[PDB]
Design a protein around this nucleic acid. Structure first.
Ligand code: MN
Ligand code: ZN
Length: 207
RNA sequence: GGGC
RNA sequence: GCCC
């Protein structure tokens, strides 16, 4: 609305906690970013630094629910009911807190660039690895094998017709890095954001 | 050819 | 199916 004037989706307390958590990100380490959903209506966001194993991973409820269902069928297969408990404002807050002039690597930078441009972050530099589907997803199976427990959102059947493994923003980052590095390391990853920041947590009585 |  |  024209009479609605809200600066942040998050409280100062939570913005301060986000600021501190994001000190785990190295401003100069290789950093992957991927999203599921349209750049103007993202539903899953991931950033990944292989050098430390740190990742940022969170979700967002879509506005265009009709487009979402169509995108789910052909790409991400995310159940929309699973996106209810998400934190609003988190996409903007994370992006706003990214280091100035950060270099982010991605596969098909067009959508990532639009999202970042829409958040006023034209200072961020983007490296596009511009691989084929085949080359970019060489380690798809090995990544899912090792890290499936890190995302449970992709339960829908995704079609290409032929059925395919759903696209996860987090698994994508990890497998794209594996492709470029020419191998997948066995290593335990670390979530940068606290769980209660990403999802609504826990009532002992209804009403 | 990419992306969802 | 929609986007570049
Ligand atoms: Mn992508
Ligand atoms: Zn996922």
């Amino acid at each position: 609305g024209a009479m609605d004037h809200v600066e942040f989706g998050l409280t100062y307390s939570q913005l301060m906690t986000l600021k501190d958590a994001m000190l785990q990100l190295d401003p100069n380490a290789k950093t992957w970013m991927d999203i599921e959903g349209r750049p103007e209506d993202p539903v899953e966001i991931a950033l990944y630094q292989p050098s430390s194993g740190c990742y940022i991973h969170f979700f967002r409820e879509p506005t265009d629910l009709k487009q979402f269902k169509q995108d789910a069928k052909y790409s991400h297969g995310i159940d929309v009911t699973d996106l209810f408990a998400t934190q609003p404002g988190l996409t903007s807050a994370v992006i706003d807190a990214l280091p100035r002039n950060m270099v982010i690597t991605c596969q098909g930078s067009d959508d990532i660039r639009k999202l970042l441009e829409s958040q006023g972050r034209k200072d961020i530099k983007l490296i596009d690895i511009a691989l084929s589907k085949t080359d970019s997803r060489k380690y798809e199976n090995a990544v899912w094998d090792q890290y499936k427990d890190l995302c449970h959102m992709h339960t829908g059947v995704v079609v290409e017709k032929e059925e395919i493994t759903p696209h996860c923003a987090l698994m994508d980052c990890i497998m794209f890095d594996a492709a470029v590095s020419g191998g997948l390391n066995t290593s335990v990853l670390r979530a940068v954001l606290p769980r209660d920041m990403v999802f609504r947590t826990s009532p002992r009585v209804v009403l």
